[model samples]
Target: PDISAKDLRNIMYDHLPGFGTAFHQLVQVICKLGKDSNSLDIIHAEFQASLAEGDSPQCALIQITKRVPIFQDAAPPVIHIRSRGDIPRACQKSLRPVPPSPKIDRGWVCVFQLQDGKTLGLKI
Candidate 1:
């Protein structure tokens, strides 16, 4: 529970190359940690990617997280931040806000100052 998320990320890509197969397990693990651990942003990106590609692993993730009292579309949004960049603009940086390109944007999973929501959190 005390390991840095970067280590886990490295371990996943290097050794556990199939995030899809082991996805459900990480769902439980990261959900328990939530904001307490950096892994939040890891799966956080997966949702937008899945959504963009017409895949909804998020709903499935929530299915296993059924007992948690955390479901709402009106919620402001959480991490997985990235610059608009060259990609086509996809969600509202506004409401029910989903981001674009989960393939990019390391900051959402970077470090304290990145996902810390220090600046962007207040700007809107």
Candidate 2:
């Protein structure tokens, strides 16, 4: 199936609430990974597999990050970040970056919150 970015975003938005905005931004980045449909297909399959495993949407995202190196290598979405001055205007205050902590080697960070109010920062 050829799925547009909006289709994926809508599906994910219904499956997960707090992560809607992040997922929408993520779909945009994934779409830019290549010219073919492979990226979207892989992501859709991963998402479905995770759901079948009874994982929360947040955990599903973590699984995808671990399984897809491209997703890990992708830069953080521009929409997810705000200028330091723009932080106050953010809808989710907790999404704001805190002071940088000591690095535990090197890895990509996937930061997102779940609908139940759980927040996560996974190193992939």
Candidate 3:
């Protein structure tokens, strides 16, 4: 059984929020985990488990992705930012700089190009 985009969206929505237009782009990448139900089931189970453990949405997402062997070995794409002004353009956001966080050292963005040529961006 193939995992549909609708199913993926529903799964993500079950445990996460703040999913706006940019979410659709990420969904496209998620739906390609595998063409079988088994993989989908495993992925979904992991997501549920992560949420149950009180992990943040972003942390759960990274955990789920890392659980997949293929994705585990996939490195994030390199992004170059010459100055603070370049962040918004590179991240495709309106803000020139990301909000300050005491826990975070610096802002970084990772762009993943899926096999179908669609792209997803994750802020780090």
- Who wins the lDDT comparison? 2
How well is each residue in 1-118 modelled by candidate 2, as lDDT tens digits? 5876667656766775554244443444444442243676688788889999899876776566567666554444232433333322323333434224411122324344444444
Superposed model 1: Cα runs more than 4 Å off: 1-59, 64-66, 72-82, 86-124
Clashing pairs in 2: none
lDDT winner between candidates 1 and 3: 3
Tell me the lDDT of model 2 at 80: 41
How well is each residue in 1-96 modelled by candidate 1, as lDDT tens digits? 554555444433343323433342333344445445344454555444445666455443443233223322212233344442311132123112
Error of 3 at 33 (Å): 2.9
Can you give the lDDT of residue 87 in candidate 1?
17
| Candidate scoring better on TM-score of 1 and 3 | 3
| lDDT order of candidates, top first | 2, 3, 1
Reference-based lDDT, residue 7, model 3? 88
Q: Which 10 consecutive residues of model 2 have the lowest summed lDDT?
A: 98-107
> Candidate 2 vs. truth: CA RMSD?
8.1
Judge candidate 2 against the unseen true structure and give its global Cα lDDT, from 0 to 1: 0.50
Global lDDT of each candidate: 0.34, 0.50, 0.48
Model 1: residue 11 alpha-carbon error in angstroms: 11
Residues forming the 10-long window of minimal summed lDDT in candidate 1: 103-112
lDDT head-to-head 2 vs 3, winner? 2
